[PDB]
Each structure stands twice: as C-alpha cells, then as structure tokens.
Amino acid sequence: SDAPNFVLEDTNGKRIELSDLKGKGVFLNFWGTWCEPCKKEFPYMANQYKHFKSQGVEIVAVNVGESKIAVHNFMKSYGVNFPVVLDTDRQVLDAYDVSPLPTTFLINPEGKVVKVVTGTMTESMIHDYMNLIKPG
C-alpha cells in the first residue's frame, strides 16, 4: 500500500515532502509530548539513527499539533538527533488514519507501507524495523 504523501515543515522551517524521500527507507513516526512510550523510545531511535542514517534509512517524527516550543523542549530533553515535522492542523494524522499514539509506519524505498507498528518497541525492535526498510 502506498503511503499517503504530505508536505510539512521540520522544526527549523525546512519544507519536507514524503516523496522527496523515495530511495530511502522511512521510519515514519506519529507522536506527541504526552506519550510516555515516546520518552523511552525517542532516545532509542536517536541511537539507532546514528547507525542507520548512512545506510539510507530516514526518520520522520511527525508531532501531532503541538506548539513549536513544546516540541523543541521535548527534543532537547530526550536527545533527538533526527528530523521532526509539525502536523499543525493534524491533517497528516487523519491521512494516515492514526490512533493510538505513537504509531510508526515503516515505508520501504519504493514508498510503500510494509508494517504499521502500534504499542511498545524495544531498541532491538527498532533496530530490526530499520533493517526491514533499509535500501541495502
């Protein structure tokens, strides 16, 4: 299944579009600063990102609607080193049909959804999920 495309701005103002990432695996996260699991999981994605970014896996952590400042504070507190976008009007969330939070979509290099993950992820899981969608 094709991942609905979207265009959003990351927390530095940069226009990011899903289809611009064709060729890379995309670890697509929907999250909010009130999710306990993301407090645990963002450090793990950060640490796996050190390894996977040069393998051609990208993270896109879609924050569901919160203020630039609430997001910035969460990113500093949990050592985030990956791209975060702002779903300001929560329209990408509805395009993805998401509930609960977090939910992660594993999108392969050809732009298709290979796995939808809800519920808890260990760092070992995150590792595997990223190997599942890496180009090489």
mmCIF file of N, CA and C in Angstrom:
data_model
loop_
_atom_site.group_PDB
_atom_site.id
_atom_site.type_symbol
_atom_site.label_atom_id
_atom_site.label_comp_id
_atom_site.label_asym_id
_atom_site.label_seq_id
_atom_site.Cartn_x
_atom_site.Cartn_y
_atom_site.Cartn_z
ATOM 1 N N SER A 1 0.821 -1.265 0.000
ATOM 2 C CA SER A 1 0.000 0.000 0.000
ATOM 3 C C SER A 1 0.824 1.269 0.000
ATOM 4 N N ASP A 2 0.393 2.230 -0.808
ATOM 5 C CA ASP A 2 1.088 3.480 -0.982
ATOM 6 C C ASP A 2 0.914 4.390 0.224
ATOM 7 N N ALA A 3 2.019 4.988 0.683
ATOM 8 C CA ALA A 3 1.977 5.838 1.817
ATOM 9 C C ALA A 3 1.452 7.187 1.380
ATOM 10 N N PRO A 4 0.314 7.616 1.935
ATOM 11 C CA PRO A 4 -0.106 8.983 1.505
ATOM 12 C C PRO A 4 1.044 10.000 1.623
ATOM 13 N N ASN A 5 1.244 10.786 0.577
ATOM 14 C CA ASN A 5 2.297 11.781 0.524
ATOM 15 C C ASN A 5 1.875 12.961 1.381
ATOM 16 N N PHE A 6 2.807 13.824 1.809
ATOM 17 C CA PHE A 6 2.489 15.018 2.592
ATOM 18 C C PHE A 6 3.644 15.985 2.502
ATOM 19 N N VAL A 7 3.426 17.238 2.875
ATOM 20 C CA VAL A 7 4.475 18.228 2.915
ATOM 21 C C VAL A 7 4.338 18.937 4.253
ATOM 22 N N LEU A 8 5.421 19.039 5.015
ATOM 23 C CA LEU A 8 5.329 19.597 6.351
ATOM 24 C C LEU A 8 6.623 20.323 6.583
ATOM 25 N N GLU A 9 6.692 21.130 7.631
ATOM 26 C CA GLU A 9 7.902 21.837 7.903
ATOM 27 C C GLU A 9 8.564 21.225 9.119
ATOM 28 N N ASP A 10 9.876 21.060 9.073
ATOM 29 C CA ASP A 10 10.503 20.490 10.241
ATOM 30 C C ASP A 10 10.684 21.592 11.272
ATOM 31 N N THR A 11 11.269 21.292 12.422
ATOM 32 C CA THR A 11 11.359 22.293 13.469
ATOM 33 C C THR A 11 12.400 23.412 13.204
ATOM 34 N N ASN A 12 13.004 23.426 12.013
ATOM 35 C CA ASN A 12 13.900 24.533 11.592
ATOM 36 C C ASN A 12 13.318 25.283 10.390
ATOM 37 N N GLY A 13 12.054 25.029 10.067
ATOM 38 C CA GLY A 13 11.433 25.748 8.969
ATOM 39 C C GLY A 13 11.594 25.104 7.598
ATOM 40 N N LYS A 14 12.268 23.969 7.531
ATOM 41 C CA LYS A 14 12.529 23.376 6.231
ATOM 42 C C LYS A 14 11.363 22.544 5.708
ATOM 43 N N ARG A 15 10.972 22.835 4.480
ATOM 44 C CA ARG A 15 9.929 22.069 3.794
ATOM 45 C C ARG A 15 10.406 20.650 3.532
ATOM 46 N N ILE A 16 9.707 19.681 4.145
ATOM 47 C CA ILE A 16 9.949 18.259 3.887
ATOM 48 C C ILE A 16 8.747 17.608 3.261
ATOM 49 N N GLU A 17 8.965 16.830 2.196
ATOM 50 C CA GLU A 17 7.911 16.121 1.482
ATOM 51 C C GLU A 17 8.200 14.618 1.431
ATOM 52 N N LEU A 18 7.214 13.785 1.738
ATOM 53 C CA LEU A 18 7.472 12.350 1.748
ATOM 54 C C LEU A 18 8.106 11.797 0.456
ATOM 55 N N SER A 19 7.545 12.176 -0.688
ATOM 56 C CA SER A 19 8.023 11.665 -1.984
ATOM 57 C C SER A 19 9.431 12.125 -2.326
ATOM 58 N N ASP A 20 9.886 13.259 -1.800
ATOM 59 C CA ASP A 20 11.312 13.569 -1.910
ATOM 60 C C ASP A 20 12.239 12.487 -1.282
ATOM 61 N N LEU A 21 11.693 11.595 -0.452
ATOM 62 C CA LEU A 21 12.478 10.559 0.228
ATOM 63 C C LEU A 21 12.415 9.204 -0.509
ATOM 64 N N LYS A 22 11.882 9.210 -1.727
ATOM 65 C CA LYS A 22 11.875 7.923 -2.472
ATOM 66 C C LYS A 22 13.344 7.469 -2.660
ATOM 67 N N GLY A 23 13.603 6.165 -2.491
ATOM 68 C CA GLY A 23 15.005 5.700 -2.495
ATOM 69 C C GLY A 23 15.596 5.429 -1.104
ATOM 70 N N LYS A 24 15.027 6.053 -0.083
ATOM 71 C CA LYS A 24 15.403 5.770 1.274
ATOM 72 C C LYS A 24 14.271 5.104 1.967
ATOM 73 N N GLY A 25 14.581 4.241 2.941
ATOM 74 C CA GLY A 25 13.556 3.740 3.850
ATOM 75 C C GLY A 25 13.130 4.843 4.797
ATOM 76 N N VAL A 26 11.851 4.880 5.162
ATOM 77 C CA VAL A 26 11.399 5.970 6.046
ATOM 78 C C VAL A 26 10.706 5.419 7.230
ATOM 79 N N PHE A 27 11.217 5.785 8.404
ATOM 80 C CA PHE A 27 10.699 5.322 9.671
ATOM 81 C C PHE A 27 9.803 6.467 10.112
ATOM 82 N N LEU A 28 8.500 6.307 9.841
ATOM 83 C CA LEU A 28 7.523 7.369 9.976
ATOM 84 C C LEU A 28 6.759 7.304 11.283
ATOM 85 N N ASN A 29 7.056 8.233 12.149
ATOM 86 C CA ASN A 29 6.547 8.202 13.496
ATOM 87 C C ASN A 29 5.453 9.265 13.728
ATOM 88 N N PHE A 30 4.280 8.891 14.241
ATOM 89 C CA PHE A 30 3.349 9.903 14.812
ATOM 90 C C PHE A 30 3.350 9.908 16.345
ATOM 91 N N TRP A 31 3.578 11.085 16.919
ATOM 92 C CA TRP A 31 3.880 11.216 18.341
ATOM 93 C C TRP A 31 3.378 12.573 18.936
ATOM 94 N N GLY A 32 3.362 12.640 20.264
ATOM 95 C CA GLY A 32 3.006 13.842 20.998
ATOM 96 C C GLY A 32 3.823 13.854 22.285
ATOM 97 N N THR A 33 4.088 15.035 22.847
ATOM 98 C CA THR A 33 4.944 15.116 24.016
ATOM 99 C C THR A 33 4.329 14.509 25.275
ATOM 100 N N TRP A 34 3.066 14.116 25.230
ATOM 101 C CA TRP A 34 2.488 13.491 26.395
ATOM 102 C C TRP A 34 2.567 11.951 26.387
ATOM 103 N N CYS A 35 3.197 11.343 25.383
ATOM 104 C CA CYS A 35 3.229 9.879 25.280
ATOM 105 C C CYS A 35 4.430 9.395 25.993
ATOM 106 N N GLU A 36 4.175 8.609 27.032
ATOM 107 C CA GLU A 36 5.220 8.018 27.875
ATOM 108 C C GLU A 36 6.109 7.144 27.054
ATOM 109 N N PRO A 37 5.503 6.304 26.194
ATOM 110 C CA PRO A 37 6.361 5.469 25.363
ATOM 111 C C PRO A 37 7.380 6.268 24.522
ATOM 112 N N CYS A 38 7.038 7.471 24.052
ATOM 113 C CA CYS A 38 7.989 8.225 23.234
ATOM 114 C C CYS A 38 9.158 8.746 24.053
ATOM 115 N N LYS A 39 8.952 8.977 25.366
ATOM 116 C CA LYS A 39 10.034 9.374 26.270
ATOM 117 C C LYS A 39 11.069 8.271 26.334
ATOM 118 N N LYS A 40 10.617 7.041 26.202
ATOM 119 C CA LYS A 40 11.520 5.903 26.277
ATOM 120 C C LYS A 40 12.146 5.634 24.898
ATOM 121 N N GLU A 41 11.339 5.844 23.871
ATOM 122 C CA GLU A 41 11.635 5.363 22.547
ATOM 123 C C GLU A 41 12.430 6.310 21.673
ATOM 124 N N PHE A 42 12.275 7.615 21.912
ATOM 125 C CA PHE A 42 12.985 8.601 21.134
ATOM 126 C C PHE A 42 14.503 8.475 21.340
ATOM 127 N N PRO A 43 14.987 8.310 22.601
ATOM 128 C CA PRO A 43 16.432 8.020 22.782
ATOM 129 C C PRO A 43 16.919 6.806 22.004
ATOM 130 N N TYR A 44 16.093 5.761 21.911
ATOM 131 C CA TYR A 44 16.422 4.570 21.119
ATOM 132 C C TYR A 44 16.470 4.784 19.612
ATOM 133 N N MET A 45 15.498 5.519 19.076
ATOM 134 C CA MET A 45 15.526 5.921 17.686
ATOM 135 C C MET A 45 16.757 6.822 17.422
ATOM 136 N N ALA A 46 17.072 7.690 18.379
ATOM 137 C CA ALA A 46 18.225 8.577 18.233
ATOM 138 C C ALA A 46 19.483 7.721 18.123
ATOM 139 N N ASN A 47 19.571 6.684 18.950
ATOM 140 C CA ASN A 47 20.774 5.895 18.961
ATOM 141 C C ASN A 47 20.914 4.966 17.733
ATOM 142 N N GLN A 48 19.801 4.381 17.287
ATOM 143 C CA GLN A 48 19.748 3.640 16.064
ATOM 144 C C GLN A 48 19.959 4.508 14.796
ATOM 145 N N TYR A 49 19.505 5.753 14.849
ATOM 146 C CA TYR A 49 19.744 6.713 13.771
ATOM 147 C C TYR A 49 21.214 6.972 13.503
ATOM 148 N N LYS A 50 22.025 6.910 14.563
ATOM 149 C CA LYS A 50 23.475 7.089 14.403
ATOM 150 C C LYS A 50 23.997 6.054 13.429
ATOM 151 N N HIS A 51 23.445 4.851 13.529
ATOM 152 C CA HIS A 51 23.842 3.749 12.692
ATOM 153 C C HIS A 51 23.139 3.701 11.328
ATOM 154 N N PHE A 52 21.830 3.978 11.278
ATOM 155 C CA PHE A 52 21.056 3.805 10.052
ATOM 156 C C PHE A 52 21.029 4.982 9.032
ATOM 157 N N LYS A 53 21.271 6.205 9.475
ATOM 158 C CA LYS A 53 21.231 7.319 8.588
ATOM 159 C C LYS A 53 22.165 7.128 7.415
ATOM 160 N N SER A 54 23.348 6.575 7.643
ATOM 161 C CA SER A 54 24.197 6.431 6.472
ATOM 162 C C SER A 54 23.931 5.138 5.715
ATOM 163 N N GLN A 55 23.033 4.278 6.239
ATOM 164 C CA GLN A 55 22.526 3.130 5.487
ATOM 165 C C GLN A 55 21.381 3.550 4.578
ATOM 166 N N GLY A 56 20.996 4.809 4.614
ATOM 167 C CA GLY A 56 19.823 5.191 3.805
ATOM 168 C C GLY A 56 18.447 4.910 4.428
ATOM 169 N N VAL A 57 18.363 4.914 5.747
ATOM 170 C CA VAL A 57 17.076 4.941 6.428
ATOM 171 C C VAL A 57 16.905 6.326 7.001
ATOM 172 N N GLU A 58 15.734 6.914 6.784
ATOM 173 C CA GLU A 58 15.441 8.208 7.335
ATOM 174 C C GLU A 58 14.377 8.090 8.385
ATOM 175 N N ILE A 59 14.442 8.939 9.400
ATOM 176 C CA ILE A 59 13.339 9.066 10.359
ATOM 177 C C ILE A 59 12.582 10.351 10.028
ATOM 178 N N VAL A 60 11.256 10.287 10.116
ATOM 179 C CA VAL A 60 10.424 11.461 10.117
ATOM 180 C C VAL A 60 9.433 11.345 11.298
ATOM 181 N N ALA A 61 9.670 12.114 12.352
ATOM 182 C CA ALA A 61 8.841 12.065 13.554
ATOM 183 C C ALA A 61 7.780 13.173 13.496
ATOM 184 N N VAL A 62 6.563 12.776 13.160
ATOM 185 C CA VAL A 62 5.501 13.726 12.944
ATOM 186 C C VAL A 62 4.831 14.051 14.283
ATOM 187 N N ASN A 63 5.132 15.223 14.830
ATOM 188 C CA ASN A 63 4.451 15.683 16.020
ATOM 189 C C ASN A 63 3.009 16.116 15.740
ATOM 190 N N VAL A 64 2.078 15.556 16.493
ATOM 191 C CA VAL A 64 0.651 15.807 16.241
ATOM 192 C C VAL A 64 0.100 17.162 16.793
ATOM 193 N N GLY A 65 0.506 18.319 16.281
ATOM 194 C CA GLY A 65 -0.247 19.562 16.565
ATOM 195 C C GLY A 65 0.248 20.501 17.668
ATOM 196 N N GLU A 66 1.328 20.142 18.346
ATOM 197 C CA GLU A 66 1.769 20.945 19.483
ATOM 198 C C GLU A 66 2.663 22.097 19.045
ATOM 199 N N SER A 67 2.799 23.076 19.939
ATOM 200 C CA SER A 67 3.494 24.303 19.651
ATOM 201 C C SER A 67 4.973 24.048 19.394
ATOM 202 N N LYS A 68 5.569 24.864 18.529
ATOM 203 C CA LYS A 68 6.995 24.790 18.212
ATOM 204 C C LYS A 68 7.851 24.630 19.491
ATOM 205 N N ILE A 69 7.466 25.351 20.539
ATOM 206 C CA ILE A 69 8.180 25.379 21.810
ATOM 207 C C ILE A 69 8.011 24.109 22.649
ATOM 208 N N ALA A 70 6.801 23.561 22.704
ATOM 209 C CA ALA A 70 6.607 22.296 23.421
ATOM 210 C C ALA A 70 7.450 21.178 22.756
ATOM 211 N N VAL A 71 7.422 21.123 21.419
ATOM 212 C CA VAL A 71 8.252 20.201 20.659
ATOM 213 C C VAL A 71 9.758 20.427 20.926
ATOM 214 N N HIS A 72 10.212 21.664 20.829
ATOM 215 C CA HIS A 72 11.632 21.954 20.981
ATOM 216 C C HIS A 72 12.078 21.451 22.320
ATOM 217 N N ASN A 73 11.240 21.652 23.352
ATOM 218 C CA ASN A 73 11.638 21.263 24.709
ATOM 219 C C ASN A 73 11.723 19.749 24.833
ATOM 220 N N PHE A 74 10.751 19.057 24.247
ATOM 221 C CA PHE A 74 10.800 17.600 24.264
ATOM 222 C C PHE A 74 12.080 17.046 23.547
ATOM 223 N N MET A 75 12.446 17.634 22.395
ATOM 224 C CA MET A 75 13.636 17.244 21.617
ATOM 225 C C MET A 75 14.951 17.436 22.359
ATOM 226 N N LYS A 76 15.056 18.546 23.071
ATOM 227 C CA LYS A 76 16.218 18.765 23.897
ATOM 228 C C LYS A 76 16.262 17.784 25.076
ATOM 229 N N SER A 77 15.109 17.570 25.730
ATOM 230 C CA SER A 77 15.056 16.708 26.913
ATOM 231 C C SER A 77 15.405 15.242 26.589
ATOM 232 N N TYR A 78 14.944 14.739 25.447
ATOM 233 C CA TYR A 78 15.224 13.334 25.048
ATOM 234 C C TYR A 78 16.310 13.111 23.982
ATOM 235 N N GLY A 79 17.215 14.071 23.845
ATOM 236 C CA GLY A 79 18.351 13.958 22.889
ATOM 237 C C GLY A 79 17.969 13.477 21.488
ATOM 238 N N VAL A 80 17.101 14.235 20.815
ATOM 239 C CA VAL A 80 16.621 13.914 19.484
ATOM 240 C C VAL A 80 17.626 14.434 18.428
ATOM 241 N N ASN A 81 18.030 13.587 17.480
ATOM 242 C CA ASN A 81 19.082 13.924 16.521
ATOM 243 C C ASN A 81 18.528 13.614 15.140
ATOM 244 N N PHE A 82 17.214 13.384 15.110
ATOM 245 C CA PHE A 82 16.511 13.068 13.893
ATOM 246 C C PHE A 82 15.527 14.165 13.464
ATOM 247 N N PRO A 83 15.094 14.120 12.207
ATOM 248 C CA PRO A 83 14.105 15.084 11.713
ATOM 249 C C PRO A 83 12.731 14.999 12.444
ATOM 250 N N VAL A 84 12.221 16.142 12.895
ATOM 251 C CA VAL A 84 10.877 16.211 13.425
ATOM 252 C C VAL A 84 10.018 17.204 12.579
ATOM 253 N N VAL A 85 8.838 16.775 12.119
ATOM 254 C CA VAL A 85 7.957 17.691 11.431
ATOM 255 C C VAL A 85 6.754 18.057 12.294
ATOM 256 N N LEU A 86 6.067 19.138 11.925
ATOM 257 C CA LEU A 86 4.938 19.646 12.703
ATOM 258 C C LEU A 86 3.654 19.508 11.942
ATOM 259 N N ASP A 87 2.810 18.540 12.343
ATOM 260 C CA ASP A 87 1.433 18.363 11.788
ATOM 261 C C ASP A 87 0.479 19.342 12.488
ATOM 262 N N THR A 88 0.577 20.629 12.155
ATOM 263 C CA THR A 88 -0.071 21.730 12.896
ATOM 264 C C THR A 88 -1.604 21.616 12.976
ATOM 265 N N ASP A 89 -2.204 21.210 11.862
ATOM 266 C CA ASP A 89 -3.642 21.065 11.820
ATOM 267 C C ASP A 89 -4.072 19.608 11.864
ATOM 268 N N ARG A 90 -3.106 18.690 12.064
ATOM 269 C CA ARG A 90 -3.391 17.278 12.314
ATOM 270 C C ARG A 90 -3.982 16.608 11.092
ATOM 271 N N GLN A 91 -3.703 17.161 9.923
ATOM 272 C CA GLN A 91 -4.218 16.618 8.657
ATOM 273 C C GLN A 91 -3.455 15.403 8.140
ATOM 274 N N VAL A 92 -2.143 15.328 8.432
ATOM 275 C CA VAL A 92 -1.398 14.140 8.037
ATOM 276 C C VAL A 92 -1.842 12.984 8.925
ATOM 277 N N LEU A 93 -2.015 13.243 10.206
ATOM 278 C CA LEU A 93 -2.549 12.242 11.137
ATOM 279 C C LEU A 93 -3.840 11.596 10.574
ATOM 280 N N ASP A 94 -4.765 12.409 10.054
ATOM 281 C CA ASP A 94 -6.035 11.893 9.509
ATOM 282 C C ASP A 94 -5.797 11.202 8.172
ATOM 283 N N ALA A 95 -4.794 11.666 7.427
ATOM 284 C CA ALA A 95 -4.483 10.989 6.147
ATOM 285 C C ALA A 95 -3.926 9.613 6.432
ATOM 286 N N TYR A 96 -3.206 9.477 7.542
ATOM 287 C CA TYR A 96 -2.645 8.169 7.878
ATOM 288 C C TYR A 96 -3.641 7.305 8.648
ATOM 289 N N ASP A 97 -4.775 7.919 9.030
ATOM 290 C CA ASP A 97 -5.786 7.207 9.794
ATOM 291 C C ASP A 97 -5.247 6.749 11.176
ATOM 292 N N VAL A 98 -4.373 7.542 11.796
ATOM 293 C CA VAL A 98 -3.696 7.131 13.017
ATOM 294 C C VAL A 98 -4.581 7.221 14.257
ATOM 295 N N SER A 99 -4.426 6.196 15.107
ATOM 296 C CA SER A 99 -4.889 6.092 16.529
ATOM 297 C C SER A 99 -4.575 4.625 16.942
ATOM 298 N N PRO A 100 -3.772 4.427 18.026
ATOM 299 C CA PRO A 100 -3.258 5.345 19.041
ATOM 300 C C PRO A 100 -2.013 6.173 18.696
ATOM 301 N N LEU A 101 -1.431 6.748 19.738
ATOM 302 C CA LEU A 101 -0.148 7.378 19.668
ATOM 303 C C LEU A 101 0.787 6.723 20.658
ATOM 304 N N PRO A 102 2.040 6.482 20.269
ATOM 305 C CA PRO A 102 2.633 6.675 18.951
ATOM 306 C C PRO A 102 2.149 5.590 17.991
ATOM 307 N N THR A 103 2.333 5.839 16.694
ATOM 308 C CA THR A 103 2.187 4.807 15.700
ATOM 309 C C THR A 103 3.278 5.107 14.748
ATOM 310 N N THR A 104 3.900 4.038 14.251
ATOM 311 C CA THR A 104 5.028 4.094 13.368
ATOM 312 C C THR A 104 4.650 3.383 12.083
ATOM 313 N N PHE A 105 4.916 4.022 10.947
ATOM 314 C CA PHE A 105 4.779 3.360 9.624
ATOM 315 C C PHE A 105 6.136 3.100 9.040
ATOM 316 N N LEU A 106 6.362 1.864 8.627
ATOM 317 C CA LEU A 106 7.644 1.504 8.035
ATOM 318 C C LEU A 106 7.413 1.552 6.549
ATOM 319 N N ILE A 107 8.059 2.501 5.885
ATOM 320 C CA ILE A 107 7.850 2.760 4.467
ATOM 321 C C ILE A 107 9.149 2.426 3.719
ATOM 322 N N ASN A 108 9.050 1.479 2.778
ATOM 323 C CA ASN A 108 10.200 0.953 2.038
ATOM 324 C C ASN A 108 10.714 1.950 1.014
ATOM 325 N N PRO A 109 11.895 1.664 0.433
ATOM 326 C CA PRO A 109 12.443 2.568 -0.599
ATOM 327 C C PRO A 109 11.501 2.914 -1.777
ATOM 328 N N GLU A 110 10.556 2.043 -2.117
ATOM 329 C CA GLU A 110 9.645 2.236 -3.230
ATOM 330 C C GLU A 110 8.421 3.029 -2.756
ATOM 331 N N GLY A 111 8.460 3.506 -1.510
ATOM 332 C CA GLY A 111 7.367 4.329 -0.931
ATOM 333 C C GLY A 111 6.116 3.583 -0.474
ATOM 334 N N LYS A 112 6.271 2.289 -0.193
ATOM 335 C CA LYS A 112 5.118 1.518 0.272
ATOM 336 C C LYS A 112 5.232 1.159 1.733
ATOM 337 N N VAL A 113 4.053 1.025 2.376
ATOM 338 C CA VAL A 113 3.929 0.774 3.805
ATOM 339 C C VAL A 113 4.119 -0.727 3.951
ATOM 340 N N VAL A 114 5.196 -1.119 4.627
ATOM 341 C CA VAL A 114 5.467 -2.553 4.808
ATOM 342 C C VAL A 114 5.020 -3.085 6.165
ATOM 343 N N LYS A 115 4.897 -2.188 7.150
ATOM 344 C CA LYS A 115 4.465 -2.550 8.508
ATOM 345 C C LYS A 115 3.909 -1.325 9.225
ATOM 346 N N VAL A 116 2.844 -1.537 9.977
ATOM 347 C CA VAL A 116 2.366 -0.500 10.842
ATOM 348 C C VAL A 116 2.635 -0.955 12.272
ATOM 349 N N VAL A 117 3.309 -0.143 13.072
ATOM 350 C CA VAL A 117 3.547 -0.546 14.452
ATOM 351 C C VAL A 117 2.780 0.341 15.451
ATOM 352 N N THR A 118 2.012 -0.317 16.316
ATOM 353 C CA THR A 118 1.436 0.336 17.491
ATOM 354 C C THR A 118 1.999 -0.342 18.767
ATOM 355 N N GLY A 119 1.787 0.243 19.928
ATOM 356 C CA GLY A 119 2.334 -0.454 21.116
ATOM 357 C C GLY A 119 3.858 -0.523 21.198
ATOM 358 N N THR A 120 4.389 -1.057 22.279
ATOM 359 C CA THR A 120 5.764 -0.757 22.692
ATOM 360 C C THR A 120 6.866 -1.299 21.780
ATOM 361 N N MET A 121 7.957 -0.559 21.661
ATOM 362 C CA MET A 121 9.090 -1.038 20.915
ATOM 363 C C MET A 121 10.333 -0.997 21.752
ATOM 364 N N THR A 122 11.077 -2.110 21.783
ATOM 365 C CA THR A 122 12.395 -2.123 22.418
ATOM 366 C C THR A 122 13.448 -1.557 21.414
ATOM 367 N N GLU A 123 14.679 -1.337 21.844
ATOM 368 C CA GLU A 123 15.631 -0.786 20.890
ATOM 369 C C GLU A 123 16.017 -1.858 19.885
ATOM 370 N N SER A 124 16.015 -3.092 20.339
ATOM 371 C CA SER A 124 16.240 -4.241 19.492
ATOM 372 C C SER A 124 15.143 -4.323 18.381
ATOM 373 N N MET A 125 13.886 -4.062 18.710
ATOM 374 C CA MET A 125 12.807 -3.976 17.723
ATOM 375 C C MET A 125 13.071 -2.860 16.704
ATOM 376 N N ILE A 126 13.418 -1.678 17.203
ATOM 377 C CA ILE A 126 13.659 -0.531 16.371
ATOM 378 C C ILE A 126 14.779 -0.874 15.369
ATOM 379 N N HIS A 127 15.830 -1.519 15.867
ATOM 380 C CA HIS A 127 16.929 -1.974 15.021
ATOM 381 C C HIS A 127 16.365 -2.820 13.900
ATOM 382 N N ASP A 128 15.599 -3.863 14.245
ATOM 383 C CA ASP A 128 15.094 -4.760 13.223
ATOM 384 C C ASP A 128 14.193 -4.044 12.225
ATOM 385 N N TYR A 129 13.300 -3.190 12.714
ATOM 386 C CA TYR A 129 12.364 -2.482 11.866
ATOM 387 C C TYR A 129 13.131 -1.593 10.887
ATOM 388 N N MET A 130 14.220 -1.006 11.334
ATOM 389 C CA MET A 130 15.020 -0.205 10.439
ATOM 390 C C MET A 130 15.744 -1.073 9.401
ATOM 391 N N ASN A 131 16.232 -2.282 9.774
ATOM 392 C CA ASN A 131 16.840 -3.229 8.779
ATOM 393 C C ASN A 131 15.782 -3.685 7.759
ATOM 394 N N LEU A 132 14.529 -3.734 8.177
ATOM 395 C CA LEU A 132 13.484 -4.159 7.285
ATOM 396 C C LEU A 132 13.313 -3.181 6.123
ATOM 397 N N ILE A 133 13.613 -1.904 6.324
ATOM 398 C CA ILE A 133 13.315 -0.945 5.272
ATOM 399 C C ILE A 133 14.566 -0.291 4.726
ATOM 400 N N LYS A 134 15.751 -0.742 5.144
ATOM 401 C CA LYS A 134 16.960 -0.092 4.622
ATOM 402 C C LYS A 134 17.178 -0.545 3.183
ATOM 403 N N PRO A 135 17.622 0.388 2.309
ATOM 404 C CA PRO A 135 17.908 0.135 0.903
ATOM 405 C C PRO A 135 18.818 -1.074 0.668
ATOM 406 N N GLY A 136 19.892 -1.200 1.435
ATOM 407 C CA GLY A 136 20.994 -2.055 1.024
ATOM 408 C C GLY A 136 21.280 -3.243 1.912
#
